[PDB]
Amino acid sequence: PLIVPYNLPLPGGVVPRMLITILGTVKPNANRIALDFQRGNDVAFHFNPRFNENNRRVIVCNTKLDNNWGREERQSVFPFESGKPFKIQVLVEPDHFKVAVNDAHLLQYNHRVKKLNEISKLGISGDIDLTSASYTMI
Numbered sequence: 442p443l444i445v446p447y448n449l450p451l452p453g454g455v456v457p458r459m460l461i462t463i464l465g466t467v468k469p470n471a472n473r474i475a476l477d478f479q480r481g482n483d484v485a486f487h488f489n490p491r492f493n494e495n496n497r498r499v500i501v502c503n504t505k506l507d508n509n510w511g512r513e514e515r516q517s518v519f520p521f522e523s524g525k526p527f528k529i530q531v532l533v534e535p536d537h538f539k540v541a542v543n544d545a546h547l548l549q550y551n552h553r554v555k556k557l558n559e560i561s562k563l564g565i566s567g568d569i570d571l572t573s574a575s576y577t578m579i
């Protein structure tokens with residue numbers, strides 16, 4: 442197991458055709474998960490499953506620039522379940538991050554941060570047991 446919150450360095454940032462794979466298990470009674478693809482203090486891509494926001498489950502995606510969160514992009518398709526193992530695949534494509542969970546496409550998030558090669562860390566946090574976090578070029 443990896444200790445959460447976990448920092449995965451992304452050496453030289455991200456680039457199209459880079460695939461980031463996160464394996465873990467959601468804790469029982471989880472409230473949140475977060476992936477934070479960071480460009481320094483900025484969060485180029487925040488991917489945030491919320492298990493109980495006003496008694497609904499939703500994935501909130503956003504970008505944080507100069508400590509300001511921007512416009513949220515929300516996805517009510519919610520493939521995570523408390524207690525269950527998951528796989529998150531984040532594929533960097535030219536215009537967006539493409540996220541699949543458990544081998545099913547979930548969402549895309551258009552690049553707001555343009556300096557992809559400066560998005561050099563992925564923070565993984567929240568109510569999970571983290572099994573692995575890695576990347577490969579496909």
Ligand SMILES: OC[C@H]1O[C@H](OC[C@H]2O[C@H](O[C@]3(CO[C@H]4O[C@H](CO)[C@H](O)[C@H](O)[C@H]4O)O[C@H](CO)[C@@H](O)[C@@H]3O)[C@H](O)[C@@H](O)[C@@H]2O)[C@H](O)[C@@H](O)[C@H]1O
Pocket residue numbers: 487489501502503510511512513
């Ligand atoms: O429920 C409606 C909401 O309306 C006002 O807030 C508007 C404000 O909401 C969001 O701003 C933040 C974002 O931080 C949270 O979400 C990001 C991802 O987007 C991260 O997950 C953070 O960890 C979360 O804490 O949410 C609070 C407000 O709820 C702000 O302090 C944060 O900036 C949204 O991202 C942003 O665009 C939008 O302007 C109202 O203030 C709220 O009380 C609430 O009624």
